[PDB]
Design an enzyme around this catalytic site. Structure first.
Site, PDB file in Angstrom:
ATOM      1  N   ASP C  20     -28.808  -1.460  35.201  1.00 45.27           N
ATOM      2  CA  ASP C  20     -28.569  -0.039  34.980  1.00 45.27           C
ATOM      3  C   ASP C  20     -29.031   0.338  33.578  1.00 45.27           C
ATOM      4  OD1 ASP C  20     -27.482   0.200  37.482  1.00 45.27           O
ATOM      5  OD2 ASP C  20     -25.435   0.643  36.821  1.00 45.27           O
ATOM      6  N   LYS C  77     -29.999   6.479  41.679  1.00 48.08           N
ATOM      7  CA  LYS C  77     -28.860   6.623  42.574  1.00 48.08           C
ATOM      8  C   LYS C  77     -28.776   8.023  43.165  1.00 48.08           C
ATOM      9  CE  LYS C  77     -25.968   3.043  40.459  1.00 48.08           C
ATOM     10  NZ  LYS C  77     -25.945   2.196  41.686  1.00 48.08           N
ATOM     11  N   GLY C 149     -17.386  -1.415  37.287  1.00 46.09           N
ATOM     12  CA  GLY C 149     -16.993  -1.020  35.940  1.00 46.09           C
ATOM     13  C   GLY C 149     -15.689  -1.629  35.463  1.00 46.09           C
ATOM     14  N   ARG C 161     -18.444 -13.759  50.241  1.00 44.11           N
ATOM     15  CA  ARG C 161     -17.898 -14.756  51.158  1.00 44.11           C
ATOM     16  C   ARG C 161     -17.592 -14.130  52.512  1.00 44.11           C
ATOM     17  NH1 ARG C 161     -16.954 -19.745  49.519  1.00 44.11           N
ATOM     18  NH2 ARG C 161     -16.620 -20.244  47.306  1.00 44.11           N
ATOM     19  N   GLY C 210     -18.932  -6.335  38.635  1.00 41.40           N
ATOM     20  CA  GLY C 210     -18.175  -7.178  37.719  1.00 41.40           C
ATOM     21  C   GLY C 210     -18.944  -8.367  37.181  1.00 41.40           C
ATOM     22  N   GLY C 231     -24.365  -3.554  35.863  1.00 41.37           N
ATOM     23  CA  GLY C 231     -24.115  -2.185  35.408  1.00 41.37           C
ATOM     24  C   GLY C 231     -23.635  -2.111  33.971  1.00 41.37           C
TER      25      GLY C 231
END
EC number: 4.3.3.6
Lengths: 255, 259, 269, 269, 258
Positions: C20, C77, C149, C161, C210, C231
């Site tokens: 980003d 986006k 975030g 998973r 994350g 991000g």
């Protein structure tokens, strides 16, 4: 209008009793007692056998009605073919369509429909009902309580509407889930725009006269039939005459 | 018929953008940016605006002037009609004056705009006299998600109605709790019987074009809450006129500033 | 098919780290660190969360600038369901469009019809059914998203998973039971069988959410992803960090290298 | 009867605007604007709400002063059930007593027995049963109250329509069903029939609660009220506003006049 | 081969499929003009004894059907190897696999499957059902539920027909049906396979009502009546002349106890 015409047909039944019959014999008795019409009927309950309906029609000169199951527009096509005078889309027999009633405007034969309140009545009329029966108990309970309830509910709502602030009538139509234009009409007439008969639990002359004094136009009826039937016809005809009502009820036999 | 005429009056707004204004200045900036019409208005109870400021706005611009009345406040309406407003917006963004009843709009000569969230509600407003429907999402958030929901809701049901078996329309009318006449009339036209705009959240040119691409005849905007209002206003106006032209949409959205 | 081609176009991203960016400088630092592509937006997810307001498509201006500063592909986006924000991005000449759920949902009930576009789409997902539905709508690339975030990778791990788990279950499943599986997934039977046969998502699959450290990125690759979104700029030193993450993805199966690129990276978010 | 006389005394208020006042000046500005009567209290409802504490009958002193400043009738509020606050007001020589639910309820279960007084009473109500009960207790005048000290007229509209709605229902009702109606209303059968025959409340009926603008006041009159209470001084310019409201009530069926008196009135509450 | 099975089913359009538990009836059914017969024979209800199925397949010249418990793919293998024309994976028999239906594509013979709504129909078809019967109540003589399901399916089909293409993805999700078949159905404007009605069809009027609602034919379970031969013929005639009220009056005239 074709609807006005149908509504005009039912209007000849005013002041009368309609008797449910299951053979030519019962139909003949009913006519003799002065019934304004007979309604033919023969577990799942269906439209009656056309043969039976033909025999009844031939045996009497009063108008002949027959039942179709709710939403069974073919049964109604059949009845109209064999030339009945009225079709009752009747919740007394087994419903065939839980969500939709017959589109009664597609028929030439006038329809009766049942109702338990003003919103229901108006919905049936918008679908093209030319006449309304304000119904109590569905079975033969011989108890007029629910019928009185539903007649008072209908009559009472009509009186409320009659005097209602015009601005509030839109919401009123929404609340009873009724077509606005018909609600407006009912307001103008101070009356439901079609003939209205009481039905359900009518067992005695007093019962039948009670319905008339509550404002109905007539009644449906479901150990001496000829006498009892005559008594009820007289009751409806002279519903305001207590002395007559007394004579009518005297030794009528077991109700 | 008087109603048909009112409906006709609202059709001269098609393809247009209606802008909220609070002063004469904004009204001009709005007309200057090509707004079809202007909407006059000024926590705390929100009521009809002072006729003084309404008169000043109707005297600054030559495009149609609209004004808000509280839901059910028929006297506010009477006052707006008496001062020569072109349209009355019985709007839910003002403080509801009556919880159970809307203004009986037929009793007026001026055409009304009402809001709605679904087909049944739109048809009920129309039966009460409304000549123009505003499908409203969220007010004062800049988020168009609710407007999209409602536009799709109304237009969705209209399409369902178009192809529905006639013997099932009665029950459908009941479920919507809407007048059968208007339901059938909506079935026939295959669209809403009156002009339909979108309102709520429209904050960018793309938002406005999206509404038009969904089926809206136009949009409301509530602009000066942006960085450069004059610029943002024109962009939105152009967006509505050229809603199916990406090249253009890019050209008017470029360097628009803080939205 | 034109969909086969879009899917192909995304294959070039396998082994990549998408970043980003909110301006040129950053886009340049992103390519300078070896990012396979940049994703232009006027606010990073961490700032979107911490701030609020309504997050929309970014102003073309700031997109045109970025697209002229770098030579690697440029993404942008578009709010979920906002097919006009898309049209605008397509017209602007971007490489990929991310119909992104980190922006403010524009349509609660319907995603953008992505087939109506010649430009490839990336869509977010959280499980296999959600991925197969996005793909059927036209999505050419899938990113399984965790939480956005927060700098916490736990939800991304759960989703990865989740998707890969069912894919393995699907592969060995009795043919006669796949119909029911499709129903339960609420996914098109055709794509389910195409996923069964292939043994993986019929499109490129990235991890997102994350990913803060090199170890995080390498973890996603070892779980079976094709690359990661980040991000980086919410850390101590973006450049060193961005480079380390890129290297981690390229050397994900090499602990010695992972130790190298993680050493003295500075303060993470 | 002495009750017939009190009821008559209130007839002179039809077409009027009663105003709350907290001192002389105001009472003078209220009469100067054409108020049919003033209502003396040491705090306006808006201040009662915003402040708290216990709102009681006002100090006689401030009532005697007001009653000597104006020539129009003077009212005063007595806490609900507080028949001694009443006795004191009666002794002070006021025209009307408002057993007011905007003050702090003194008796939760019983209203003041108003018959025991020679001075007329005004009582608040929210529906028809509540009005007929207040009347049976002696109330000579009824005010259907919405919400107090908010400037929002919505609840007043609800109550007005409520009372007038049932009155219309009652008028056309089958005689044999009125008994049940009285039970459901929880109101004395005698007053219900007297209301049926008359086609309206057997006493003067004013609107009260949130009446802020001229349009509000005129609305109440068009709904069928006999006048309005205003709790004017919490606005920009009381005089102009008070005059406009008075005029609105007198010209409630005249939009042109309504526009006139509403123009440049200043900031409302 | 699937498009071939579908075609084999379209033959039956405008027909009446009648249940039968022996030869005599099968003949009494064909002699009334049935377009096919359905072989059968509290307590678990399973596939019928082959013997009796062969006795019926050799007693008539119209197609012969047979029931196989839902999910019982071996009962089907047996029916196929018997050489009957259609297999009905029917929910009137005792459910055999609560979680999965038979993979019908693994068979040569055409399959009938029951359904109550559009999603259910589309799922059965994707499993390889060549023909779909919308079932109401079984063995009650009441058609109320059949009417409900028929209106349900035909209703959503009409909704789908005119729906915004963008919104179809979500519609398929809500139906829990394959997107391909949904868009197909949207293109055709009807079920992509033959659609009959079944459940509570007792009288000629019932049969005609189903046709007027938009069904391709009807199943009947006639024999529960006072005169089978007469009733059967009437129902057959009703389906053939389902628009002729004057005709429907004749065939309903004195048909005995239903």
């Amino acid at each position: 209008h074709p609807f006005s015409v149908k509504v005009g047909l039912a209007q000849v039944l005013r002041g009368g009793a309609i008797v449910e019959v299951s053979s030519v014999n019962q139909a003949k008795l009913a006519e003799s007692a002065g019934a304004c019409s007979v309604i033919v009927s023969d577990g799942v309950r269906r439209m009656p056998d056309p043969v039976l309906i033909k025999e009844v029609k031939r045996a009497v000169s009063v108008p002949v009605m027959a039942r179709a199951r709710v939403g069974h527009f073919v049964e109604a096509q059949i009845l109209e073919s064999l030339a009945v005078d009225y079709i009752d889309e009747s919740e007394i027999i087994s419903v065939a369509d839980d969500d939709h009633f017959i589109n009664k405007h597609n028929f030439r034969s006038p329809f009766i429909c049942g109702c338990r309140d003003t919103g229901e009545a108006l919905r049936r009329i918008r679908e093209g009902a030319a006449m309304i029966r304000i119904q109590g108990d569905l079975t033969a309970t011989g108890n007029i309580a629910e019928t009185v309830k539903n007649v008072r509910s209908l009559m009472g709502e009509v009186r409320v509407l009659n005097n209602m602030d015009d601005d509030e009538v839109f919401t009123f139509a929404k609340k009873i889930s009724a077509p606005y234009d018909l609600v407006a009409q009912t307001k103008q007439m101070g009356r439901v725009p079609v003939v209205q008969f009481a039905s359900g639990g009518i067992t005695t002359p007093a019962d039948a006269a009670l319905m008339m004094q509550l404002g109905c136009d007539g009644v449906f009826v479901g150990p001496d039939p000829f006498k009892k039937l005559r008594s009820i016809v007289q009751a409806v005809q002279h519903y305001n005459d207590p002395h007559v009502l007394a004579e009518m009820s005297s030794g009528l036999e077991n109700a | 018929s008087p109603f048909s005429v009112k409906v006709g009056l609202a059709q001269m707004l098609r393809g247009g953008v209606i802008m909220d204004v609070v002063n004469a200045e904004q009204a001009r900036i709005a007309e200057e940016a090509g707004a079809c019409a202007v909407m006059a208005l000024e926590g705390g109870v929100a009521r009809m605006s002072d006729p003084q400021m309404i008169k000043e706005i109707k005297q600054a611009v030559t495009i149609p002037v609209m004004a808000k009345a509280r839901i059910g406040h028929f006297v506010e309406a009477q006052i707006l009609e008496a001062i020569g407003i072109d349209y009355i917006d019985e709007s839910e963004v003002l403080t509801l004056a009556d919880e159970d009843h809307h203004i009986n709009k037929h009793n007026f000569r001026i055409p009304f705009v009402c809001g709605c969230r679904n087909l049944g509600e739109a048809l009920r407003r129309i039966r009460e006299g409304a000549a123009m429907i505003r499908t409203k999402g969220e007010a004062g958030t800049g988020n168009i998600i609710e407007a999209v929901r409602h536009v799709r809701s109304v237009n969705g049901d209209i399409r369902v109605l178009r192809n529905m078996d006639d013997d099932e329309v009665f029950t459908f009318a009941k479920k919507l709790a809407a007048p059968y006449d208007l339901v059938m009339q909506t079935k026939q036209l295959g669209r809403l019987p009156v002009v339909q705009f979108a309102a709520g959240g429209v904050a960018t040119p793309a938002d406005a074009a999206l509404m038009m691409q969904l089926g809206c005849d136009g949009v409301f905007v509530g602009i000066f809450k942006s960085g450069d209002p004059a610029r943002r206003a024109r962009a939105i106006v152009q967006a509505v006129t050229h809603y199916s032209d990406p090249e253009m949409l890019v050209e008017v959205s470029c360097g628009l500033g803080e939205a």
